[PDB]
Write a protein that binds this DNA or RNA. Structure first.
Lengths: 57, 49, 836
RNA sequence: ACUCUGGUUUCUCUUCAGAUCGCAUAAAUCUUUCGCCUUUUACUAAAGAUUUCCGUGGAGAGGAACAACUCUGAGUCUU
């Protein structure tokens, strides 16, 4: 079998907490390897960006 | 970038970047590399991806 | 080496101090740095920590401290005098708080490690509170100062702001618990010490001023330090210290002279090793070889800080100046710890800490060797000298001056002083020291008082080790092969010795339940049981918490019981106790040892009770400090008082037994007020015996409790989580899933991390740490500690409810389930019998 | 502030490898369970035992490099 069967999947969870893993913002300045920085910037929730702009004097 | 990558631009794309540079590498055997903080920071900034 | 033993002769050049703090606050790293300073041949690896003072396999593998470890070591002082220090390396995890207390009881002083970036956190607050309870000397060390430089990059002014805020918070917390104002903490006073244990930085104001003096000369480091903190500023025009800034943009003295050099010495090592480091290294007199300059940033920084700050004399002189020696600090220890008190002749003898006085040691620690079949006692010598190969008389926790059964005569073989992993054998140990004792494991169970036989026969014991938290987690433990049951039983004894707060209890059905504070506590307990003591396979039941029993309404009618002689009739009523009053009895606010006038005054004044009712109070609940009250209410116009006093004691034991084992949940009646409304005592002594009255008292207590509508109290844990801002919303949902209500969410000052404090049911708190850590990808970490019993939703006496198996029942059903299954775990009946 | 201090590189060889030999990762054989099963040759996937292979460190020995003073430090090094 060249490909892999879908039955081999281990990340099957009935718990929504594990189904929806809270993504790490990495202090709003870190970036996960591989993904282009622009896509992550426009994808990140920008909670830290909002906090920074609120605390920007 | 001529300004950000100042230390590494000379030897970044060589076959063995710093082989004959006795300061950074012990010799032709190309072992036990010794670097400086600026070039390491430049390399990290380039390799953030 | 011999000087180490000879220094024990002088009772002033020894300091008994315990190192306590929150989880991972550099305590073990600090002890490693001290060891490296005093042991030339011991050096940590460049990337891996030394991990010294941690000898257990679990200690290294988990990375969390488990067992408090004794470290005896000689350190020079700031002036240059070699003092002797004994250190309790205590676990910072709240679940191992008991492991602190065993080392806290025999410790004169407390060094509180607080992480600079983290803040106070929960275990630090609990530790300072509990150390205030023993009235120990308090010193604060803000460790991990580098985290304000190399992690947050806070400006030195903001770094001073953060340090001052932390110090003020600690001082306010102490003032909220300790009445004595002498416990104020300030670096100029020698209380607060700054440190970064990873890079071997350890300095106080005095130590840094002395460094300045040795750099220049003819400088009074004491008076210089007394002007090196606060709103004080420095003027170089006049070289003068003022209370106002000489200029507009001037910096404070602490920033100017202390924080600034540290910032620059770190920056020149982390950023400019090859460019600017040699210049500043030659400037400060630090001479590093060519090879030494070739190390990585962290080992090089540690090396340069070791060469610059030199010895750890700041910690040494802090302990010398603020932590009393055993000779002078024994008096409060005897006042608070010994049962007989300082008034007695033994109290006076042991207060002086006389090496020639009567022999008396207080053992509160048990250590397991490689075999695990022979434990070693560890404790403080409070008077006299113990000798190797000597007969001693060991007392027990229940020993009194009457009962001589609890004692036992044992021969002590070779004994040693434990320096973490290695211990130095010594022929004898004078008073005030911490000693490992051999050959006394068999009669010693947890707390122990050891004295010499054939003398000082009027010797009592010290008060039992009191723990801050109430162990509520309970796990049943069985053997896989019943043919190997005795071995596991043996192993149980061992763990019961090893862990001070471990309670191993065999129930009626034969289930060996073990009481633990939290998940990690029981995990380590069972790892030790399987892999070190029993060495046989074991089985665990599903974890469950204990439950208490209470009442919420007055008993509908007075419930009566009669002796089998049918001549003594006791009729009682049931009511709940007032708010806080149960907590008052829990915290020993009011004690049965109080004379009747004082306790009556407390009850009538603070809680608005009747003066006669306050004088009518008979006894407390399950123990002397039980949260239940037994109050006489027989009217003198119908019931004789002197005759009733004969059986008052027997009724007291009966009520205590009834509160110990509740009719509903088989244990732990809590927050219940019982009034005896009628007493018919048989006129002859033989018809009112204890064997007759006590069962009758138990029956009447059960009837009164059950007649009033009972309720089950489940323990609510107070869990605070330190997490980044983005994870707060997720933590809210995770706590909402497990029926927990959120109280506070305060962002930590000087750090981008919030701290959310909430209350979660302990029965629903299992796996909460793992859930929260994995759900937020390790960003949110939690610690759980017992907070308070709370009424569980539901009615335990509503039989119309049907319990669906293997299903999480709704709240109105929970109580019923929580008792019924509990009864099945005890082997008891299906339903509580009101008649019985 | 001084006299002597004597290099480092590189090619080999010979032994020892404790340590993540290796901040990387193979294959084969054998033995147990296996999955396929129908004969070898390929195999399924876990455990256990060796082995070979791509590498590695140290020590010692023998060359070349190739110069060379010195580096560095033993100290009296001095105002």
């Amino acid at each position: 079998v060249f490909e892999w069967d879908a039955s081999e999947d281990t990340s099957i969870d009935y718990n929504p907490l594990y189904k929806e893993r809270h993504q790490v913002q990495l202090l709003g300045r870190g970036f996960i390897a591989g993904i282009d920085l622009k896509q992550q910037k426009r994808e990140q929730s920008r909670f830290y960006g909002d906090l920074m702009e609120k605390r920007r004097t | 970038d001529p300004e950000e990558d100042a230390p590494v631009l000379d030897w970044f794309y060589d076959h063995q970047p710093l082989r004959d540079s006795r300061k950074y590498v012990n010799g032709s055997t190309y072992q036990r590399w010794q670097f400086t903080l600026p070039m390491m920071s430049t390399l990290y900034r380039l390799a953030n991806q | 080496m011999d000087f180490l033993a000879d220094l024990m002769d002088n009772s002033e050049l020894i300091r008994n101090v315990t190192l306590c703090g929150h989880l991972h606050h550099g305590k073990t790293c600090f002890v490693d740095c001290l060891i490296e300073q005093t042991h030339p041949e011991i050096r940590k690896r460049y990337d891996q920590d030394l991990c010294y003072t941690d000898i257990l396999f679990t200690e290294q593998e988990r990375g969390v401290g488990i067992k408090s470890t004794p470290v005896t070591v000689v350190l020079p002082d700031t002036k240059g005098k070699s003092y002797l220090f004994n250190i309790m390396d205590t676990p910072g995890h709240v679940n191992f708080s008991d492991e602190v207390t065993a080392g806290l009881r025999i410790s004169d002083g407390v060094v509180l490690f607080i992480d600079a970036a983290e803040g106070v956190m929960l275990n630090t607050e609990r530790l300072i509170k509990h150390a205030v309870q023993e009235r120990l000397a308090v010193t604060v060390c803000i460790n991990k100062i580098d985290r304000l430089i190399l992690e947050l990059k806070l400006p030195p002014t903001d770094a001073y702001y953060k340090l001052r805020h932390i110090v003020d918070e600690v001082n306010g917390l102490i003032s909220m618990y300790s009445t004595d104002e002498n416990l104020i903490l300030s670096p100029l006073l020698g209380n607060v010490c700054f440190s970064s244990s990873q890079y071997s930085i350890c300095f106080t104001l005095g130590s840094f001023a002395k460094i300045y003096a040795d750099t220049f000369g003819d400088i009074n480091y004491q008076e210089f330090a007394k002007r090196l903190w606060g709103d004080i500023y420095f003027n170089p025009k006049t070289r003068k210290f003022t209370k106002k800034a000489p200029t507009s943009s001037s910096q404070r003295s602490f920033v100017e002279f202390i924080l600034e050099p540290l910032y620059k010495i770190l920056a020149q090592v982390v950023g400019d090793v090859d460019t600017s480091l040699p210049r500043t290294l030659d400037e400060l007199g630090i001479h590093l070889t060519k090879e030494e300059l070739k190390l990585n940033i962290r080992p090089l920084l540690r090396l340069v800080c070791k060469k610059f700050f030199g010895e750890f004399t700041g910690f040494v002189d802090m302990c010398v100046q603020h932590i009393p020696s055993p000779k002078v600090g024994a008096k409060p220890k005897i006042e608070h710890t010994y049962t007989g008190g300082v008034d007695s002749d033994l109290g006076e003898a042991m207060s002086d800490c006389d090496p020639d006085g009567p022999l008396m040691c207080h053992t509160t620690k048990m250590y397991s060797t490689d075999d695990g079949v022979q434990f070693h006692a560890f404790g403080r010598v409070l008077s006299g000298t113990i000798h190797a190969g000597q007969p001693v008389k060991v007392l027990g926790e229940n020993y009194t001056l009457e009962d001589e059964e609890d004692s036992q005569i044992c021969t002590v073989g070779r004994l040693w002083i434990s320096v973490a992993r290695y211990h130095i054998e010594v022929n004898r140990v004078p008073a005030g020291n911490w000693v490992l004792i051999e050959g006394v494991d068999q009669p010693i169970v947890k707390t122990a008082t050891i004295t010499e036989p054939r003398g000082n026969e009027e010797a009592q014991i010290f008060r039992p080790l009191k723990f801050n938290t109430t162990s509520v987690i309970k796990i049943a433990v069985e053997p896989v092969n019943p043919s190997e049951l005795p071995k596991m039983l043996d192993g149980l004894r061992k763990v019961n010795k090893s862990y001070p707060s471990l309670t191993t209890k065999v129930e009626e059905s034969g289930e060996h339940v073990i009481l633990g504070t939290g998940e990690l506590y029981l995990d380590c307990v069972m790892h030790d049981l399987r892999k070190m003591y029993s060495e046989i396979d074991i089985k665990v039941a599903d974890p469950v918490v204990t439950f208490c029993e209470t009442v919420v309404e007055t008993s509908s009618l007075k419930c009566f019981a009669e002796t089998p002689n049918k001549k003594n009739k006791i009729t009682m009523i049931a009511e709940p106790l007032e708010k806080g009053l149960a907590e008052d009895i829990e915290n020993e606010v009011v004690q049965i040892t109080w004379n009747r006038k004082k306790l009556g005054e407390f009850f009538q004044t603070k809680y608005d009770w009747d003066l006669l009712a306050a004088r009518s109070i008979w006894a407390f609940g399950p123990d002397a400090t039980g949260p239940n009250i037994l109050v006489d209410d027989t009217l003198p116009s119908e019931v004789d008082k002197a005759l009733l006093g004969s059986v008052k004691d027997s009724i007291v034991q009966g009520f205590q037994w009834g509160t110990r084992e509740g009719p509903l949940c088989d244990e732990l009646i809590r927050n219940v007020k019982f009034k005896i409304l009628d007493a018919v005592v048989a006129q002859e002594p033989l018809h009112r015996g204890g064997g007759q009255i006590i069962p009758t008292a138990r029956r009447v207590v059960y009837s009164a409790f059950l007649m009033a509508t009972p309720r089950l109290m489940e323990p609510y844990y107070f869990v605070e989580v330190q997490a980044p801002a983005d994870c707060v919303s997720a933590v809210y949902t995770v706590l909402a899933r497990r029926r927990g209500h959120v109280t506070q969410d305060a962002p930590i000052p000087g750090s981008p991390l919030y701290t959310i404090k909430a209350f979660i049911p302990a029965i629903d708190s299992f796996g909460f740490e793992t859930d929260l850590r994995t759900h937020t990808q390790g960003q949110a970490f939690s610690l759980s500690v017992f907070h308070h019993w709370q009424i569980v939703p539901g009615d335990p006496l509503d039989k119309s409810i049907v319990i669906r198996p293997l299903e999480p029942q709704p709240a109105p059903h929970l109580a019923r389930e929580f008792m019924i299954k509990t009864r099945r775990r005890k082997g008891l009946s299906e339903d509580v019998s009101i008649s019985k």
